[PDB]
Amino acid sequence: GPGGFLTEVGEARQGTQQDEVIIAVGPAFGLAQTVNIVGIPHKSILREVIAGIEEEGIKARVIRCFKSSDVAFVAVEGNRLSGSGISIGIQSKGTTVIHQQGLPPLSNLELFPQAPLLTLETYRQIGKNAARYAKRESPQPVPTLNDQMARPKYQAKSAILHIKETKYVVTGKNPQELRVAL
Amino acid sequence: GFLTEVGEARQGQQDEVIIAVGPAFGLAQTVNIVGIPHKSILREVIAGIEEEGIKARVIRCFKSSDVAFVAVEGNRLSGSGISIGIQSKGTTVIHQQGLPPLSNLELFPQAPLLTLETYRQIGKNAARYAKRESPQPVPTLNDQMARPKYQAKSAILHIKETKYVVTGKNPQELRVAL
Amino acid sequence: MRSKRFEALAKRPVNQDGFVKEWIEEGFIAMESPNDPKPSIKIVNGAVTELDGKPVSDFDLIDHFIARYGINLNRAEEVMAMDSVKLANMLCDPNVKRSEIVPLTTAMTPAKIVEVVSHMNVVEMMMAMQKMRARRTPSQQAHVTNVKDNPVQIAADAAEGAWRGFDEQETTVAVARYAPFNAIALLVGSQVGRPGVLTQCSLEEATELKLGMLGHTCYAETISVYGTEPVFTDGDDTPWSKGFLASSYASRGLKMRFTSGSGSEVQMGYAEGKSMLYLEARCIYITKAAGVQGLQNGSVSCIGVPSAVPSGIRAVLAENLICSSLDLECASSNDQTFTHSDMRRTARLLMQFLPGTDFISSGYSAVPNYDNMFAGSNEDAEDFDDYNVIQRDLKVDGGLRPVREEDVIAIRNKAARALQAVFAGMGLPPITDEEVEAATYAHGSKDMPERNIVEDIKFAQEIINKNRNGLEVVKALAQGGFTDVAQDMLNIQKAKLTGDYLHTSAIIVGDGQVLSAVNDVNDYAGPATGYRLQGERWEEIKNIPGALDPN
Amino acid sequence: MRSKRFEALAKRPVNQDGFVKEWIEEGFIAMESPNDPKPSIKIVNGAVTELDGKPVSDFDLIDHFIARYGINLNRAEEVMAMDSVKLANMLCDPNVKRSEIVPLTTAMTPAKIVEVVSHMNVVEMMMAMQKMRARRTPSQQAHVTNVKDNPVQIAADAAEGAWRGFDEQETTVAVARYAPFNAIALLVGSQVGRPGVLTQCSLEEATELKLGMLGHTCYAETISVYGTEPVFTDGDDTPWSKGFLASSYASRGLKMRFTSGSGSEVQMGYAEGKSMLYLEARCIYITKAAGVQGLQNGSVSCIGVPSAVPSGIRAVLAENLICSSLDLECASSNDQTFTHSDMRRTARLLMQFLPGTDFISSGYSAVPNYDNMFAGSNEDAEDFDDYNVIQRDLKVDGGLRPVREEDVIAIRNKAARALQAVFAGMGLPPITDEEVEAATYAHGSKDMPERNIVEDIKFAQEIINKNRNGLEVVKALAQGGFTDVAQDMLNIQKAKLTGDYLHTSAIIVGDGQVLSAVNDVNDYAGPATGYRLQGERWEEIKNIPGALDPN
Amino acid sequence: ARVSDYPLANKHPEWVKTATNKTLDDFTLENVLSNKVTAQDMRITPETLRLQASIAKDAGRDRLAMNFERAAELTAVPDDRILEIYNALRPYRSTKEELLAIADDLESRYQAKICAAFVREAATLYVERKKLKGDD
Amino acid sequence: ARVSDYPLANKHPEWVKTATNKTLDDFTLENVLSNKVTAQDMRITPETLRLQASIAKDAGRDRLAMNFERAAELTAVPDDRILEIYNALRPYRSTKEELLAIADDLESRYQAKICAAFVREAATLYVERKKLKGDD
Ligand code: B12
Ligand code: B12
Ligand SMILES: C[C@H]1O[C@@H](n2cnc3c(N)ncnc32)[C@H](O)[C@@H]1O
Ligand SMILES: C[C@H]1O[C@@H](n2cnc3c(N)ncnc32)[C@H](O)[C@@H]1O
Ligand SMILES: [Ca+2]
Ligand SMILES: [Ca+2]
Ligand SMILES: [Cl-]
Ligand SMILES: [Cl-]
Ligand SMILES: [Cl-]
Ligand SMILES: [Cl-]
Numbered sequence A: 001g002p003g004g005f006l007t008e009v010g011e012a013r014q015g016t017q018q019d020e021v022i023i024a025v026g027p028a029f030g031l032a033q034t035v036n037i038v039g040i041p042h043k044s045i046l047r048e049v050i051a052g053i054e055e056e057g058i059k060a061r062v063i064r065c066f067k068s069s070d071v072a073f074v075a076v077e078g079n080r081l082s083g084s085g086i087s088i089g090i091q092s093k094g095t096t097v098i099h100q101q102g103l104p105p106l107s108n109l110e111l112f113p114q115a116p117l118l119t120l121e122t123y124r125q126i127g128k129n130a131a132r133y134a135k136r137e138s139p140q141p142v143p144t145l146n147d148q149m150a151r152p153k154y155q156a157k158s159a160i161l162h163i164k165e166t167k168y169v170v171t172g173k174n175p176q177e178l179r180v181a182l
Numbered sequence B: 001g002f003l004t005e006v007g008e009a010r011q012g013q014q015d016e017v018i019i020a021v022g023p024a025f026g027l028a029q030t031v032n033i034v035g036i037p038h039k040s041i042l043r044e045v046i047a048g049i050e051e052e053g054i055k056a057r058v059i060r061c062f063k064s065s066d067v068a069f070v071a072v073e074g075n076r077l078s079g080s081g082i083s084i085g086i087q088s089k090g091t092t093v094i095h096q097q098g099l100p101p102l103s104n105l106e107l108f109p110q111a112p113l114l115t116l117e118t119y120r121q122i123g124k125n126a127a128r129y130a131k132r133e134s135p136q137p138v139p140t141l142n143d144q145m146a147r148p149k150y151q152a153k154s155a156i157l158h159i160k161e162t163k164y165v166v167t168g169k170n171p172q173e174l175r176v177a178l
Numbered sequence C, D: 001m002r003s004k005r006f007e008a009l010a011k012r013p014v015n016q017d018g019f020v021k022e023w024i025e026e027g028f029i030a031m032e033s034p035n036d037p038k039p040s041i042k043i044v045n046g047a048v049t050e051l052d053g054k055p056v057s058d059f060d061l062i063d064h065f066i067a068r069y070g071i072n073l074n075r076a077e078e079v080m081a082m083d084s085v086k087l088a089n090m091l092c093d094p095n096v097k098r099s100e101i102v103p104l105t106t107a108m109t110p111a112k113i114v115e116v117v118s119h120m121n122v123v124e125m126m127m128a129m130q131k132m133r134a135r136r137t138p139s140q141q142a143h144v145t146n147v148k149d150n151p152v153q154i155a156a157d158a159a160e161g162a163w164r165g166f167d168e169q170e171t172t173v174a175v176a177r178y179a180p181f182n183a184i185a186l187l188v189g190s191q192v193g194r195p196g197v198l199t200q201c202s203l204e205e206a207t208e209l210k211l212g213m214l215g216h217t218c219y220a221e222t223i224s225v226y227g228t229e230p231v232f233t234d235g236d237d238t239p240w241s242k243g244f245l246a247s248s249y250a251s252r253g254l255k256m257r258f259t260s261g262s263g264s265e266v267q268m269g270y271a272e273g274k275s276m277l278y279l280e281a282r283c284i285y286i287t288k289a290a291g292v293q294g295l296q297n298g299s300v301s302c303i304g305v306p307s308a309v310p311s312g313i314r315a316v317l318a319e320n321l322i323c324s325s326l327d328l329e330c331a332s333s334n335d336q337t338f339t340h341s342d343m344r345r346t347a348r349l350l351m352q353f354l355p356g357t358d359f360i361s362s363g364y365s366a367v368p369n370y371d372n373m374f375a376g377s378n379e380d381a382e383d384f385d386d387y388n389v390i391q392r393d394l395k396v397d398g399g400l401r402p403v404r405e406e407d408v409i410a411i412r413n414k415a416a417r418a419l420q421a422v423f424a425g426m427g428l429p430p431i432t433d434e435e436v437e438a439a440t441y442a443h444g445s446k447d448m449p450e451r452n453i454v455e456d457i458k459f460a461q462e463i464i465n466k467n468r469n470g471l472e473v474v475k476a477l478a479q480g481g482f483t484d485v486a487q488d489m490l491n492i493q494k495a496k497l498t499g500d501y502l503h504t505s506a507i508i509v510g511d512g513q514v515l516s517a518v519n520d521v522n523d524y525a526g527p528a529t530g531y532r533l534q535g536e537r538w539e540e541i542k543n544i545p546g547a548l549d550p551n
Numbered sequence E, F: 001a002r003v004s005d006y007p008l009a010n011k012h013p014e015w016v017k018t019a020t021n022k023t024l025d026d027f028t029l030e031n032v033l034s035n036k037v038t039a040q041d042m043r044i045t046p047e048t049l050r051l052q053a054s055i056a057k058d059a060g061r062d063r064l065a066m067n068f069e070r071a072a073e074l075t076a077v078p079d080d081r082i083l084e085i086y087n088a089l090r091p092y093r094s095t096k097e098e099l100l101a102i103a104d105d106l107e108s109r110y111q112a113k114i115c116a117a118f119v120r121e122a123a124t125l126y127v128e129r130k131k132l133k134g135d136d
């Protein structure tokens, strides 16, 4: 696979200290696809989400999830393992969620449901806010992005990308911790 | 009140153009469909004719409110065979004796688009037709939203114009105020 | 303080349209008027003595024509006694055959059939229209015009419209003297784009018949009738002059239909206190009474009148339905601007597009609307891709197809070159190579070089004055390097010798195959019967530009 | 060298839409797929042993749920034996009563009823929908949202929407923690605009149920079901969890419907190689099997999936027709953006609007689409005048009415003042007088002052955590001078005690009067029967802004 | 002729002759170019119009067939005379005597009996409804 | 009850009582303000839901009636426990034993026999379709 930058270094273990946020990426992230739905590189997305977490004085840990390609469930697997209970799930096509242990799987703290509108500045802010939740702040939510033509332009493409993402699901396979080549 | 009758219009002599107006023109209605005064309309049509060295003769027609038949009765009385028909709402036609009533030399079928410059140019062209010249037709004006904006208003103004039709009454020559 | 909500709404294009409250006394009411007469008929010694409340002593020329020629008097009293609700039910019931209904409708009076369809909502009317449409296959008709009467552009636009699927195309004139050029250009371009497309040039009646006599048109449509006697008079005809005109066209082997449409009598100032739909029903029976095979209606050029009042667009569908139900070909309008709103004009089109009519539109503008010399159509060239997409969305055959840019360029170029050969051969003012190139790639007259209009109209009128006929065009093509087009033009002229395309709904498809309601009879009997979009025609409609292969 | 014609068309909004060629292997096909199962049913010892070719040993949870609960086995042999074309004919035949059809359609397998409606064109489907619609009177539902979750603006927009005629109104959240404020604001504003309007707040399922238990909603609709097992699973439910949830709502006296819609299984990655319409039929039968009274479908939020492929918008109407044919209330979508084109979105709306459904739109955006937190609706607040004009054009009751700006300003202001009094009375973060005026005159959140969102969501979640219930809102209204609004809020809560509005298609109209399919049974029997637009309701629809007096 | 005999061009091309007894096959580019056929030859016959009227009746369209029967008579009338008669029937063009003269001409010169009665009927009704010359 | 008995609030208001045996005319604004009635009083009863089930059956809607019968049992279950049971039926939340214990508890505490059978039915199928805890 071209553009590789994520190495699985074993089964992710649950963090014991509040000092971290887990970025949980879907099974195709950085592999079958290397950009999101509007062509922003996964490398740049992950770089900005990590930078946002770390500039808030919180550790960033990246894992890949396999049991589902749904981004909520990817984030739930992450919030189970995160020492802060806070996780960020990112699909290959770019859809992102800030999640919290104890919330229902399809609930969340913040949701970014129109991937085509996300910029690198947004991804940095998503990481900042996730870290601020980990510090038990109540951060100003990332401002809502909403474009009534996003679905007309991109829903069919979103479905095709997700279909391809789902081929990487592995029943019963626990998350793998990633070494990030950044 | 700028149009006065001066008696039944007679056959024209050859260096003239008849401007035939409908039965409500300058009376029950005094502006066209977009508010251009009838006095200004006639001023410009007459000035355009006279600028070409041709005489303008104005008549009112009564037997029909339809601008083709208004103009047709004008072209039969015109010493040049050339007439201009104008309805109150502004619709204008240059007509020629010998053509079918619903034919014409030039037609201006979207009254909302005419300006006083168009009206002067219509007079000019009619005078050139009277001189047996072949002027460039007045360039076509066409607005696809003219009917959406104005057709209902055009129908209502025509209904009102139509109340002044008089069966059997011959056209009257008009004096235009200075 | 303004509500910013209402400030936003006040800017919307629909609020530039003309709306009026109903005005019964002057007929500014679309249908279901209290002044409209109640249906009735009395017959004594085989002649009508009363028609819809009116005694024969008060008949105008329209009443006389309809009462003598337009109603089957042997069953009129029987059908008058029938319940109009049950008759309307029969109209939309998929299990009552078209052939069971036509003997009833042709025995109704104008007010009777109006009472029947006025019981129906637009869903019921569409359900009926897909059955009552005479021709099983729907078709489509386009306008081909421009504001300069530019013949090179007309020929190219006509070729493109023929290539996109229009089976009839229509021109008219900004300057009346240009007409023979507009007609010849339309005919040559249409045959280049698809041999068999029928062409017309809409003019004053005597002028249009003379032009058809010389062979420069294939048919005539704008043969107007009207629903009150004073309006008919200002239209410069009677039912008898228009009936004679109809048989005159047929006597020259030329297809023709009448045109009518709701609101003409209001526009022309004498509605006699009647609703638009009742007066239109008189027009439809005038058409039936004259023996004319078809009718263009659905308000047509007066669409701003019914659209201004309540239920006006429903009335427009109703008058199309009355036309088809009387076993007339229906060219169902959708050809004239009435609104600034895309939503509103789409709702108006779908009434006929969804069920299908003989010509869903009788004048889709094949040019941008700034060039449309019928003052704008309800659809224009910039809607071509939307129209194809909605056919694909709904699996509805609306008569058109997606096309390739390289094919359209090639066909427009051939059409312009062919007309250039016609003009050279006939000694007409030259069509230059620059003009050919411009016409090839044009969107409209904004893209065309200026012609000498004074010179053009001199030579165009010489075509009439010297009786230059259609075989001169055939010869100019054959001797100018276009023997293929020359043969197609001759084949179009040969259709005037057989009488085939004089019949109800007739067009000419494929390899000179006449397709009319005689040999393509609508046999609708509910789901999975009658015309269905399928096969290669469905593959054609599916193949729109932009569809990505998701593999 | 480019054709300027094609350069013009390439810029058209429709060419920004997403189109795809059919991809059968992944279910990217709207209906009539080669991989769809043929209808079959085998019943042994009163239990289904084979459903549409699949043996019970291969049943997934959806098959088991449908086979055990979703099919009327009492008439299953008779309807399986009937010809699917004849059955499609019966659906659109005006003279076959709805009451005669429902025992048979409810006995069909999912593939059988898919086969039946797939014989139909959209005209026939509409002809059938006007009969199969459970409630005689059509209604309408709106979205009320904004990108800031501003509660003052929600209350004002809700009041305006109720005043315009919506009988149900729906909100949701940009930030999930805001939900109690959005819900309270919607409920207060709706009761100000028209007492009896039902309100919902669309959330994750357990969250929405808890919010309903506290009394801050009146019903729930986005109770989602899916047509394949892996997709249902990523939806975090099974048929049994959703059936339990449905009964949990009813056990608290709360009206609810499910939501489904063609294309969800493609969007969520597992179509199992089946067409969208077949999978959607499975969803409709899950809803029937659960005992849920109604369903929101017509692709809904996944409309970009069927619309991308041929016959997708036809399939959308087909799935609505299946829903009503199964004797379910149908909230028929027209609530989600799929196109840049005004023409195209109008065609999609008219399929439901023309015949009428229980809710013609299940989410007309009562805010400008930039504020729509369901990512945009097929119609929005800037379309209000077009919608009213089309009602008047076609004489169709689309559930809305023209309204006066001064009335809307007053009702929006009253709603904003009532919410101000609620927040003061409940010790919530204050609504200032400046915010009240802003919401009164706003078009959307661009016109609203910024709120302290961090403080709002703190108190919003305290409502959940301290179980602050709806009677607190009643008390705060009463104590703040809004005795009338407090009484209307109390009356909405009393409707949860009788069970009356739990029945098929129930809304609350007039003075607390439930109107459902039980006491407003659709009795369509052809023209001049069933629901007709007439009387004072018709006078209301005719009275649009800008209709001038002619004389 | 029946519906099954239609269209003539596709089923029975040899049924079609022209006013000068030419066939469809005579109309080729070569014969047009050589003037072996001219516009005078290219005109539908009464026989063809009466065959199409028989088809219209079999298709249930009696009034269309009546139109074709009037057209069949009018094939004998020259183009310019057709235009004169059409003009004469327009409002306020004609005196009653002129219309009755047109009818006698149609009957006695062209044997256009149906068209002659049609024009006589117009004349009677134009008196009553005041559409004659001088009535405007 | 039949469809002629519907709506209950109009035809038979006295057939409706609340979980604390209050009537509809007890819920006045002044009784709410004075806490004479509270939210605990404002809850629909199994009796009302079984009447509405009978009306649904009479309207030809047997599956709707079955839902109302399940809902009548669930009125007895507290809000928090309803949420716990709903969540336990979602994918991968429960073991088979946890679901069967929910069912037995539904019966022993609330006599919710239909709902208990529903949960056991799900538990059996969740084994076969691998929707239990640890099956993901
Ligand atoms: C399409 C859509 C859906 C679809 C597709 C979901 C999917 N996984 O494929 C359907 C209808 C099935 C759906 C279901 C739900 N949705 Co939804 N959905 C939308 C909607 C209307 C448009 C999104 C879109 O098309 N974006 C454009 C495309 C091109 O960008 P995209 O990044 O590829 O979009 C993806 C995400 O939006 C994702 N997604 C959609 N909904 C939800 C919900 C959650 C919690 C998550 C993590 C992701 C997610 O699905 C899209 C396709 O992959 C948004 C409205 C909005 N404001 O964006 C709501 C919205 C995002 N959904 C919402 C909700 C509440 C849900 C549900 C939890 C509801 C329920 N009854 O269970 C479920 C979650 C199911 C799931 N596993 O994701 C809320 C979220 C509120 C919040 N602040 O948390 C929103 C804002 C509005 C609403 N009520 O519908 N949804
Ligand atoms: C509406 C319309 C009609 C209507 C109403 C006519 C009327 N007298 O009320 C109907 C359908 C009845 C009609 C009939 C005819 N029309 Co017309 N008509 C139009 C159209 C499509 C739109 C005009 C419009 O709405 N303007 C907007 C309003 C607000 O402005 P207005 O000034 O008030 O409009 C008035 C004039 O347009 C006038 N009018 C309309 N047609 C004609 C024709 C002639 C010769 C005259 C003098 C006036 C005239 O009627 C309108 C309302 O009073 C134009 C196309 C165009 N390019 O404009 C053709 C057009 C003007 N008509 C034309 C023709 C040929 C005719 C007929 C002669 C056809 C026939 N079969 O006999 C008849 C004439 C009947 C008559 N007594 O006027 C041609 C003119 C060609 C030319 N250069 O001479 C045009 C260009 C195109 C066409 N073929 O339809 N027409
Ligand atoms: C466009 C052409 O079609 C004919 N035409 C258009 N609309 C109508 C109508 N409502 N009534 C009669 N004739 C009409 C006229 O002849 C016009 O010139
Ligand atoms: C808007 C809300 O409605 C539901 N929803 C919307 N569209 C669909 C569909 N095609 N299938 C299932 N549920 C849907 C979801 O619950 C979503 O959140
Ligand atoms: Ca036309
Ligand atoms: Ca909704
Ligand atoms: Cl009115
Ligand atoms: Cl109706
Ligand atoms: Cl395809
Ligand atoms: Cl079909």
Ligand SMILES: [Cl-]
Binding pocket: C106, E060, E061, E062, E063, E064
């Ligand atoms: Cl007949």
Ligand SMILES: [Cl-]
Binding pocket: D106, F060, F061, F062, F063, F064
């Ligand atoms: Cl049932």
Ligand SMILES: [K+]
Binding pocket: C202, C203, C204, C205, C208, C221, C222, C223, C224
């Ligand atoms: K004409």
Ligand SMILES: [K+]
Binding pocket: C225, C226, C227, C260, C261, C262, C263, C264, C265, C279, C280, C283
């Ligand atoms: K008419």
Ligand SMILES: [K+]
Binding pocket: D202, D203, D204, D205, D208, D221, D222, D223, D224
């Ligand atoms: K929900």
Ligand SMILES: [K+]
Binding pocket: D226, D227, D260, D261, D262, D263, D264, D265, D279, D280, D283
């Ligand atoms: K579905």
